Amino acid sequence: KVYGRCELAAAMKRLGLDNYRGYSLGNWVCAAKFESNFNTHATNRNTDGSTDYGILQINSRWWCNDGRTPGSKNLCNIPCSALLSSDITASVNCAKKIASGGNGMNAWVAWRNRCKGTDVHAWIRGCRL
Numbered sequence: 001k002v003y004g005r006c007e008l009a010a011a012m013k014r015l016g017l018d019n020y021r022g023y024s025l026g027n028w029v030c031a032a033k034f035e036s037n038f039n040t041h042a043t044n045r046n047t048d049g050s051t052d053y054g055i056l057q058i059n060s061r062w063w064c065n066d067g068r069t070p071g072s073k074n075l076c077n078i079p080c081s082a083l084l085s086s087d088i089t090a091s092v093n094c095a096k097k098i099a100s101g102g103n104g105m106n107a108w109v110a111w112r113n114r115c116k117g118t119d120v121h122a123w124i125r126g127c128r129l
């Protein structure tokens with residue numbers, strides 16, 4: 001599924017991401033935009049044999065098990081296939097675990113480069129939330 005911007009903002013709000021660990025909702029919307037262009041089927045291979053899955057491009061080295069990544073730690077306790085669903089619940093629950101690490105949302109490289117420090121509140125303006 002390809003989400004609309006405000007469609008995604010609403011879904012993320014309902015799952016508890018606004019002001020999670022001090023990050024306002026627009027951070028998460030911006031991250032999803034630059035990681036996947038709001039496409040839940042997005043995948044990218046990494047050079048270490050792991051793969052990034054879904055709308056928030058969560059990797060199979062640390063976070064989910066895809067069966068083909070040797071030594072996956074599977075810290076989110078989920079198959080990576082669950083991160084490709086139209087329903088973003090599994091991706092959001094895992095994202096909260098990721099964002100609880102020391103470096104917070106810096107774990108998302110596209111957020112760090114294209115979202116961090118900007119007026120991310122723009123990403124939810126005009127949405128009914």
Ligand SMILES: CC(=O)N[C@@H]1[C@@H](O)[C@H](O[C@@H]2O[C@H](CO)[C@@H](O)[C@H](O)[C@H]2NC(C)=O)[C@@H](CO)O[C@@H]1O
Pocket residue numbers: 035046047048050052056057058059061063098107108109110
């Ligand atoms: C939260 C999450 O999974 N974010 C992804 C990053 O982990 C990806 O970065 C790549 O991560 C793999 C596995 O740890 C590293 O081997 C690799 O060096 C790293 N690549 C970069 C450029 O840092 C990122 C890839 O675009 O996708 C999400 O941000």
